[PDB]
Short mmCIF file of C-alpha atoms and ligand atoms in Angstrom, two decimals:
data_model
loop_
_atom_site.label_atom_id
_atom_site.label_comp_id
_atom_site.label_asym_id
_atom_site.label_seq_id
_atom_site.Cartn_x
_atom_site.Cartn_y
_atom_site.Cartn_z
CA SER A 1 6.79 11.98 4.89
CA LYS A 2 7.84 10.45 7.83
CA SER A 3 6.94 6.85 9.11
CA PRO A 4 5.17 6.80 12.16
CA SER A 5 6.70 6.30 15.58
CA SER A 6 4.10 3.22 16.12
CA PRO A 7 4.92 0.14 14.86
CA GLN A 8 2.11 -2.03 13.18
CA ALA A 9 0.49 -3.53 14.49
CA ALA A 10 -1.45 -6.59 14.65
CA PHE A 11 -3.96 -9.45 16.33
CA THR A 12 -4.24 -13.17 14.69
CA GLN A 13 -5.59 -16.67 15.73
CA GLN A 14 -4.47 -19.91 14.03
CA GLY A 15 -5.70 -19.82 10.56
CA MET A 16 -5.24 -16.64 10.58
CA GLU A 17 -1.73 -16.01 10.65
CA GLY A 18 -1.12 -16.63 6.41
CA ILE A 19 -2.61 -13.50 4.96
CA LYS A 20 -1.80 -9.75 5.25
CA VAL A 21 -2.44 -6.57 4.64
CA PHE A 22 -1.49 -3.91 2.48
CA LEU A 23 -3.21 0.02 2.91
CA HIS A 24 -4.00 1.38 -0.70
CA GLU A 25 -1.53 4.52 -1.19
CA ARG A 26 -0.13 4.64 2.60
CA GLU A 27 2.08 7.75 1.11
CA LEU A 28 -1.22 9.64 0.71
CA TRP A 29 -1.97 8.51 4.45
CA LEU A 30 1.74 9.49 5.88
CA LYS A 31 1.65 13.43 4.92
CA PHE A 32 -2.20 13.32 6.76
CA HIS A 33 -0.24 11.80 10.17
CA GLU A 34 2.77 14.33 9.24
CA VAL A 35 -0.09 17.07 10.27
CA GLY A 36 -1.77 15.02 12.29
CA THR A 37 -5.44 13.67 10.63
CA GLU A 38 -8.41 15.17 11.06
CA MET A 39 -11.65 13.68 10.75
CA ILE A 40 -14.93 15.76 9.93
CA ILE A 41 -18.23 14.39 12.15
CA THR A 42 -21.86 15.27 11.38
CA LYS A 43 -24.96 14.53 13.00
CA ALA A 44 -25.54 13.13 9.45
CA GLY A 45 -22.77 11.40 9.73
CA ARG A 46 -19.82 12.41 7.47
CA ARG A 47 -17.25 9.83 4.91
CA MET A 48 -13.34 9.60 5.64
CA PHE A 49 -11.00 10.96 3.75
CA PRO A 50 -8.45 9.12 2.52
CA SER A 51 -10.79 6.77 2.60
CA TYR A 52 -9.41 3.91 4.84
CA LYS A 53 -8.41 0.69 1.37
CA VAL A 54 -6.62 -2.58 1.57
CA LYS A 55 -5.88 -4.92 -0.26
CA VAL A 56 -5.38 -8.35 1.49
CA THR A 57 -3.67 -11.97 0.25
CA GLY A 58 -3.44 -15.41 1.82
CA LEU A 59 -6.65 -16.17 1.85
CA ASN A 60 -8.33 -19.60 1.45
CA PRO A 61 -9.90 -19.33 -1.76
CA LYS A 62 -13.20 -20.16 -0.58
CA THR A 63 -13.35 -20.45 2.93
CA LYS A 64 -16.29 -17.31 3.92
CA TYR A 65 -14.59 -14.25 5.62
CA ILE A 66 -15.92 -11.47 7.17
CA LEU A 67 -14.00 -8.08 6.53
CA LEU A 68 -15.13 -5.60 8.92
CA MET A 69 -13.89 -2.08 11.13
CA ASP A 70 -14.06 -0.58 13.74
CA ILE A 71 -13.07 2.50 16.01
CA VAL A 72 -11.58 2.46 19.14
CA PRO A 73 -10.36 5.22 20.75
CA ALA A 74 -6.17 5.94 20.44
CA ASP A 75 -5.09 7.47 24.07
CA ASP A 76 -7.68 8.47 26.83
CA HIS A 77 -6.80 12.52 26.04
CA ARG A 78 -9.17 15.30 24.75
CA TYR A 79 -7.26 18.06 22.47
CA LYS A 80 -7.43 20.97 21.85
CA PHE A 81 -5.85 23.09 19.17
CA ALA A 82 -4.24 26.35 19.38
CA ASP A 83 -0.90 27.62 17.87
CA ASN A 84 -0.96 24.90 15.25
CA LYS A 85 0.00 22.93 17.88
CA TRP A 86 -2.34 19.44 19.09
CA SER A 87 -1.85 19.63 22.89
CA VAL A 88 -3.91 17.35 25.75
CA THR A 89 -6.51 19.69 28.12
CA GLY A 90 -7.51 16.93 29.41
CA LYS A 91 -9.40 13.70 30.04
CA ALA A 92 -10.43 11.86 27.54
CA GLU A 93 -15.31 10.62 28.22
CA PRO A 94 -15.32 7.39 28.21
CA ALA A 95 -17.92 6.89 25.74
CA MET A 96 -20.15 4.44 23.68
CA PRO A 97 -18.89 0.52 22.70
CA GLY A 98 -17.83 0.62 20.01
CA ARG A 99 -19.79 -0.20 17.16
CA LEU A 100 -18.83 -1.54 14.01
CA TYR A 101 -18.40 -1.63 10.33
CA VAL A 102 -19.30 -4.49 8.46
CA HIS A 103 -18.67 -4.38 4.34
CA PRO A 104 -21.43 -4.86 2.81
CA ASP A 105 -20.37 -7.69 1.06
CA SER A 106 -19.86 -10.25 3.81
CA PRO A 107 -20.00 -13.06 3.78
CA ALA A 108 -17.95 -13.49 0.98
CA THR A 109 -15.45 -16.07 -0.30
CA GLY A 110 -10.97 -15.27 -0.06
CA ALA A 111 -12.03 -15.97 -3.91
CA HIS A 112 -13.57 -12.17 -3.88
CA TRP A 113 -12.25 -9.97 -1.25
CA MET A 114 -8.38 -10.78 -2.81
CA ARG A 115 -10.09 -10.22 -6.91
CA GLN A 116 -9.42 -6.39 -5.68
CA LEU A 117 -9.82 -3.57 -3.51
CA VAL A 118 -11.34 -4.17 -0.17
CA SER A 119 -12.36 -0.34 0.16
CA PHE A 120 -14.56 0.83 2.97
CA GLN A 121 -15.66 4.19 1.45
CA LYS A 122 -18.66 4.04 2.49
CA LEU A 123 -18.60 4.24 6.26
CA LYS A 124 -19.57 6.47 7.80
CA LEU A 125 -18.88 8.66 11.55
CA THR A 126 -21.18 10.84 13.31
CA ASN A 127 -21.17 12.78 16.59
CA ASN A 128 -24.49 12.01 17.81
CA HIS A 129 -24.85 9.51 20.35
CA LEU A 130 -28.84 8.62 19.79
CA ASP A 131 -27.51 8.10 15.54
CA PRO A 132 -30.42 5.20 14.16
CA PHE A 133 -28.23 4.04 10.97
CA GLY A 134 -25.64 2.07 13.08
CA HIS A 135 -23.03 4.79 11.88
CA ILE A 136 -19.77 5.04 13.97
CA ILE A 137 -20.59 6.86 16.52
CA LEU A 138 -16.95 9.82 17.93
CA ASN A 139 -16.41 12.28 20.17
CA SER A 140 -15.27 15.14 18.74
CA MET A 141 -11.62 16.82 19.75
CA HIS A 142 -10.81 12.85 20.69
CA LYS A 143 -8.18 10.89 19.01
CA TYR A 144 -8.86 7.82 17.25
CA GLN A 145 -6.87 4.28 16.02
CA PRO A 146 -9.58 2.29 12.53
CA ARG A 147 -9.06 -1.86 12.84
CA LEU A 148 -9.64 -4.51 10.02
CA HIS A 149 -11.21 -7.19 11.27
CA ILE A 150 -11.78 -10.31 9.05
CA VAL A 151 -12.97 -13.63 10.25
CA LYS A 152 -12.88 -16.54 9.09
CA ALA A 153 -15.85 -19.46 7.92
CA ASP A 154 -15.24 -22.46 10.13
CA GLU A 155 -15.30 -26.00 8.23
CA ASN A 156 -19.09 -25.93 7.36
CA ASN A 157 -18.08 -22.82 5.89
CA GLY A 158 -20.89 -20.64 8.56
CA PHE A 159 -20.12 -19.12 11.56
CA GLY A 160 -21.73 -18.96 14.14
CA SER A 161 -19.18 -22.06 15.90
CA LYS A 162 -16.31 -22.32 17.80
CA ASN A 163 -14.60 -22.96 15.75
CA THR A 164 -14.77 -18.97 14.11
CA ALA A 165 -11.68 -17.92 14.44
CA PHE A 166 -9.98 -13.12 13.66
CA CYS A 167 -7.23 -10.97 12.53
CA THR A 168 -6.81 -8.07 13.85
CA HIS A 169 -4.74 -5.01 12.44
CA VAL A 170 -3.96 -1.87 12.73
CA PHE A 171 -2.19 0.82 10.56
CA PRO A 172 -1.25 3.57 12.84
CA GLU A 173 -1.12 6.35 9.49
CA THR A 174 -4.37 5.84 9.57
CA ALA A 175 -5.40 7.03 13.48
CA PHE A 176 -6.62 10.25 13.60
CA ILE A 177 -8.74 13.64 15.87
CA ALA A 178 -12.09 13.98 15.09
CA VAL A 179 -13.59 16.77 14.69
CA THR A 180 -16.37 18.68 14.26
CA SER A 181 -14.82 22.01 12.36
CA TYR A 182 -10.94 21.37 10.87
CA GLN A 183 -8.40 23.51 12.78
CA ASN A 184 -5.35 23.37 11.43
CA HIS A 185 -5.17 24.67 8.00
CA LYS A 186 -2.58 22.45 6.67
CA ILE A 187 -5.31 19.28 6.72
CA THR A 188 -7.90 21.14 5.15
CA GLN A 189 -5.59 22.32 1.88
CA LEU A 190 -4.67 18.87 2.02
CA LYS A 191 -8.01 17.19 1.01
CA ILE A 192 -9.12 20.17 -0.77
CA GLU A 193 -5.99 19.79 -2.92
CA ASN A 194 -6.29 15.54 -3.67
CA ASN A 195 -10.18 16.04 -3.53
CA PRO A 196 -10.71 13.00 -5.87
CA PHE A 197 -13.49 15.38 -7.98
CA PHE B 1 -12.38 -9.19 19.66
CA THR B 2 -10.36 -9.50 22.27
CA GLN B 3 -7.13 -10.00 22.16
CA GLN B 4 -6.49 -12.19 25.82
CA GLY B 5 -2.93 -11.09 28.18
CA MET B 6 -1.74 -8.83 25.48
CA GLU B 7 -3.73 -5.46 24.38
CA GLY B 8 -0.57 -3.77 26.99
CA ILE B 9 1.97 -5.32 24.91
CA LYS B 10 4.57 -2.55 23.19
CA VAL B 11 7.12 -2.31 20.79
CA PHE B 12 9.93 -0.26 20.68
CA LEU B 13 12.76 0.01 17.61
CA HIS B 14 16.51 0.20 18.72
CA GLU B 15 18.04 2.30 16.76
CA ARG B 16 15.70 3.34 14.95
CA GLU B 17 17.46 6.93 13.92
CA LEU B 18 19.77 4.82 11.91
CA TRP B 19 17.35 2.24 10.76
CA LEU B 20 15.18 5.96 9.29
CA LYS B 21 18.44 7.59 7.60
CA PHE B 22 19.41 4.01 5.67
CA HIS B 23 15.26 4.36 5.33
CA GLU B 24 15.39 7.47 3.47
CA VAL B 25 18.00 6.31 1.08
CA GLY B 26 16.64 2.76 0.81
CA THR B 27 18.32 0.14 3.36
CA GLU B 28 19.98 -2.53 1.48
CA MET B 29 20.98 -5.78 2.35
CA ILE B 30 23.12 -8.26 1.44
CA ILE B 31 22.50 -11.77 1.27
CA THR B 32 25.28 -14.51 0.67
CA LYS B 33 25.65 -18.69 0.21
CA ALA B 34 27.34 -18.72 3.67
CA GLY B 35 24.52 -16.14 4.81
CA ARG B 36 24.89 -12.34 6.33
CA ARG B 37 23.96 -10.39 9.82
CA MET B 38 21.59 -8.35 8.96
CA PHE B 39 22.43 -4.93 8.78
CA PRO B 40 21.42 -2.57 10.85
CA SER B 41 21.12 -4.61 12.92
CA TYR B 42 17.11 -6.11 14.92
CA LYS B 43 16.83 -5.15 17.59
CA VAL B 44 13.32 -4.12 20.02
CA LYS B 45 12.56 -3.29 23.78
CA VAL B 46 9.61 -5.13 25.03
CA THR B 47 6.92 -3.52 27.01
CA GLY B 48 3.77 -4.39 28.71
CA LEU B 49 4.52 -8.28 29.36
CA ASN B 50 2.53 -10.18 31.86
CA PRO B 51 5.57 -9.37 34.22
CA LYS B 52 6.25 -12.71 34.08
CA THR B 53 4.59 -16.19 31.92
CA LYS B 54 6.24 -17.74 29.18
CA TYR B 55 6.20 -16.36 25.93
CA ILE B 56 7.95 -16.95 22.88
CA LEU B 57 9.73 -14.16 20.07
CA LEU B 58 9.51 -15.40 16.90
CA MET B 59 10.34 -13.29 13.26
CA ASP B 60 9.54 -13.92 9.57
CA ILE B 61 10.62 -12.18 7.06
CA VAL B 62 7.92 -11.61 4.14
CA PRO B 63 7.13 -9.67 1.17
CA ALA B 64 6.73 -6.17 1.48
CA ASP B 65 5.42 -5.95 -2.03
CA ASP B 66 5.35 -8.50 -5.14
CA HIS B 67 8.03 -6.48 -7.13
CA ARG B 68 11.55 -7.10 -8.75
CA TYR B 69 13.84 -4.31 -8.50
CA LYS B 70 16.61 -2.72 -10.96
CA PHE B 71 18.50 -0.94 -10.00
CA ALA B 72 19.70 1.56 -12.33
CA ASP B 73 20.90 5.55 -13.16
CA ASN B 74 21.32 5.91 -9.02
CA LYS B 75 18.03 5.17 -8.27
CA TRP B 76 15.39 1.86 -7.48
CA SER B 77 12.93 0.62 -9.68
CA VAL B 78 10.40 -1.29 -10.50
CA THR B 79 10.97 -3.86 -13.04
CA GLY B 80 8.84 -7.57 -12.79
CA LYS B 81 7.08 -10.04 -10.71
CA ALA B 82 8.72 -11.75 -7.63
CA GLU B 83 8.48 -15.61 -7.77
CA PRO B 84 7.23 -16.75 -4.00
CA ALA B 85 5.45 -14.74 -1.12
CA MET B 86 6.19 -17.54 1.84
CA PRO B 87 5.16 -20.47 2.64
CA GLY B 88 9.70 -19.06 4.19
CA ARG B 89 11.20 -20.20 7.16
CA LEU B 90 11.84 -18.33 10.86
CA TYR B 91 14.10 -17.74 13.64
CA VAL B 92 13.06 -18.56 16.24
CA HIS B 93 14.46 -16.25 19.55
CA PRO B 94 17.27 -19.10 21.13
CA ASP B 95 16.03 -17.05 24.83
CA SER B 96 12.95 -18.63 23.69
CA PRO B 97 10.21 -20.51 25.29
CA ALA B 98 11.52 -17.52 29.04
CA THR B 99 9.47 -15.77 30.03
CA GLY B 100 7.54 -11.57 30.69
CA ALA B 101 10.64 -10.40 32.87
CA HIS B 102 12.87 -12.00 31.88
CA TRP B 103 12.29 -10.71 27.61
CA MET B 104 11.91 -6.53 29.89
CA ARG B 105 14.96 -7.27 30.93
CA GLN B 106 17.06 -5.88 28.79
CA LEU B 107 17.20 -6.32 24.55
CA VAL B 108 15.59 -8.64 22.65
CA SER B 109 18.97 -8.56 19.94
CA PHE B 110 17.95 -10.63 17.19
CA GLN B 111 21.61 -9.44 15.61
CA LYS B 112 22.82 -13.65 15.17
CA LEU B 113 19.47 -14.08 12.62
CA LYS B 114 20.76 -14.66 8.96
CA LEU B 115 20.37 -14.22 5.42
CA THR B 116 21.57 -16.29 2.31
CA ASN B 117 20.26 -16.86 -1.33
CA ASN B 118 21.38 -20.34 -1.57
CA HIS B 119 17.80 -22.76 -1.42
CA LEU B 120 18.96 -25.48 0.18
CA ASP B 121 21.30 -24.41 3.68
CA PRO B 122 21.14 -26.70 5.63
CA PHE B 123 21.84 -23.41 9.02
CA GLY B 124 18.54 -22.35 9.79
CA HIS B 125 19.41 -18.84 7.97
CA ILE B 126 16.39 -17.44 6.00
CA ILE B 127 16.22 -17.29 2.16
CA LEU B 128 15.56 -14.65 0.48
CA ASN B 129 15.44 -13.94 -3.58
CA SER B 130 18.14 -10.89 -4.46
CA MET B 131 16.79 -7.55 -6.10
CA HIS B 132 12.85 -8.86 -4.28
CA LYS B 133 11.62 -5.94 -1.09
CA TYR B 134 11.26 -7.81 2.21
CA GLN B 135 9.65 -6.68 5.68
CA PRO B 136 11.01 -8.03 9.28
CA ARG B 137 7.66 -8.57 11.35
CA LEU B 138 8.39 -9.55 15.12
CA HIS B 139 5.77 -12.39 16.67
CA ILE B 140 5.19 -12.28 20.40
CA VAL B 141 3.23 -16.38 21.40
CA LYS B 142 1.98 -16.03 25.08
CA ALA B 143 2.88 -19.95 25.77
CA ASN B 144 -5.90 -22.53 20.66
CA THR B 145 -2.54 -20.13 19.67
CA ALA B 146 -2.64 -16.31 19.44
CA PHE B 147 -0.26 -14.23 17.56
CA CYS B 148 -0.02 -10.60 19.00
CA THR B 149 2.26 -8.97 15.43
CA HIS B 150 4.75 -5.44 15.67
CA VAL B 151 5.54 -4.31 12.19
CA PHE B 152 8.40 -1.80 11.66
CA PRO B 153 8.06 -0.70 8.39
CA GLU B 154 11.05 1.78 8.61
CA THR B 155 13.45 -1.88 8.49
CA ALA B 156 11.63 -2.80 4.97
CA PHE B 157 15.00 -3.66 2.77
CA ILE B 158 15.60 -4.70 -0.81
CA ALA B 159 17.45 -7.80 -0.83
CA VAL B 160 20.70 -7.21 -2.52
CA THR B 161 24.10 -9.75 -3.35
CA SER B 162 26.89 -6.71 -2.70
CA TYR B 163 25.69 -2.66 -2.67
CA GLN B 164 24.54 -0.98 -4.77
CA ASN B 165 22.97 2.73 -3.91
CA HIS B 166 26.35 4.92 -4.28
CA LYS B 167 24.86 6.62 -1.50
CA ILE B 168 26.09 3.64 0.20
CA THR B 169 28.86 2.94 -2.43
CA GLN B 170 30.50 6.44 -2.05
CA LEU B 171 29.84 6.94 1.88
CA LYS B 172 30.00 10.65 2.13
CA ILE B 173 30.46 11.08 5.90
CA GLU B 174 29.23 14.78 6.15
CA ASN B 175 26.66 14.34 3.25
CA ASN B 176 23.72 11.53 2.19
MG1 MG C 201 30.58 -14.57 3.16
MG1 MG C 202 29.20 -10.85 8.66
MG1 MG C 203 29.26 -7.89 0.52
#
């Protein structure tokens, strides 16, 4: 497994700088990344595989935090897959402001979040731009970067103030191309032989 | 989630192939009481800055996990749990505070940074514990404060009091 040519990046407001995030099963992610990761989108919605899970440290144990995820474009291109290669075949079709996925345990104390793995498996991806279930909407054959966001409560431990602050974190190895069906046989194979079932 | 004049910023790791080779073996960095420079040295090209407003460039070195490591039978392994994972000290780049175009004109070198194993060091060197894995981090602050941070995972390393791997100590030129 190569490492991604892009550094991990993070944007952090004061009060968040002690926090650290660790990608669960990073090597597994590196293998898909190496090949070029694809995620299937349907009208009903598909969960991601591999699923995005993180261990968090450095949270204030009884400050309240909101954990959420969004999936933003990584570039402005359409792609096609021919001759076992991804090529740029034109300009990305600008779309929705990205929806959020909020972790269902939010709001919660740092103690709660640090106690185990924050998992986002339940997050679903659709191609339907009229989705009525608040699923994340994506464009087939476009590249996307998942982002972690952590929101901290204020002194009264309650959001709605301007004394809230956030971490934003990006693992490059979790980037992927959305697809209505798999293109690279290696992706299709990695998923069958890593299928946790 | 509006990052300020900062979504455009990109960072590029210098002499990266060397970091990759060394990362593939398992990067080791010797720490001493007087303090050792990092090898490989840490240098980056910075792009996408507001051409000239004042920025401050920092580096910290933080735990990449919580394990203690042993090196046995030509291999690293987990062996226990580390001591403290922060609060730590920083290296503030000497050119700081300075301007975007300035920062962008020549490679930003962190070569003067040193690593010591003396918990009572008076020279501002970064204090590490041997046989613990660490992760160099780059922090950028535009002069209510906010950090853009860049982490190159291939610069992670285990801190040692002397080189361990025979692939380093018995360096084979036409091999690895
Ligand atoms: Mg010495
Ligand atoms: Mg030296
Ligand atoms: Mg020595």
